[PDB]
Write a protein that binds this ligand. Sequence first.
Ligand code: FMN
Length: 288
Amino acid sequence: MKILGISGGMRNGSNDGMCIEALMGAKEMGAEVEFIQLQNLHIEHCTDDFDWLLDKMLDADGIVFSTPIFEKGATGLFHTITDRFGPRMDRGNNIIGTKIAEETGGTAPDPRILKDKVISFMSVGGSDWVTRTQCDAGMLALTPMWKVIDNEVFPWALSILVEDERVARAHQIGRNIAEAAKDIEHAQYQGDAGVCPHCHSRNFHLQDGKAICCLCGLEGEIHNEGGKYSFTFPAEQLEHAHDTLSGKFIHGNDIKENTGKKIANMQTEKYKARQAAYRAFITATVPE
Ligand SMILES: Cc1cc2nc3c(=O)[nH]c(=O)nc-3n(C[C@H](O)[C@H](O)[C@H](O)COP(=O)(O)O)c2cc1C
């Protein structure tokens, strides 16, 4: 079993340490380990070393990703990696694509891409402003439907490398990812049970008559049973959940239909006239 550790913090900072401590626990379980420090990489925003990074992640049986917390969420770079997983790693599209390829004599895309995989996350912050990072982390796994093992948040963690019990927790997380990768099929989630019984998320978008889980997108109802929160949903919503094949197939077909509508709409005179007036009204300002 091959475990990859990734750190999005500063070189030789706390995320590196927690990540490496997780790698140590993974080796204790018998894993070969590798470490990638993202500050050594050049990665552009979704409109360069990304393909290299992706190849490394695809060669790993399990992944431990440690990210700083920026504004109560993961770093911009973590969000960029998530943006850029979209067109290459979506499990629905990759199943569709290799099916069309096999049936039309096309070229079989990369086998590694559809391989099952386990991943764990650690979010390390300076304070208690930490309420969005675990959902950001889940977002990265959601696209390829990698199986999350741990998804841990460390608040008040500037001095975490002298906090022995919290370092021991990174070590255990590394043991977990290693065991999980031994038998990916029977690997089991080890994290907080959360509120969403399906997602494990604690993040919700709330409107009248509809509570939406911010990770998996199930639409249902939030209950306050004396301060304890719970989340229910009609079972049929499971077909639409954003982290299932069924939900991804639906989502992708909606994108295809709506993209087709747009291409045709771009031919209309209404579209062309409005666009021409935008171009004539103003020119974009750029730095000299
Ligand atoms: C721009 C910026 C925003 C940050 N926002 C938060 C935050 O919202 N909550 C929090 O706990 N820490 C925040 N921090 C502190 C970082 O999480 C902290 O510096 C990081 O975990 C250090 O890790 P490193 O040692 O690996 O680099 C922020 C830091 C920076 C630079």
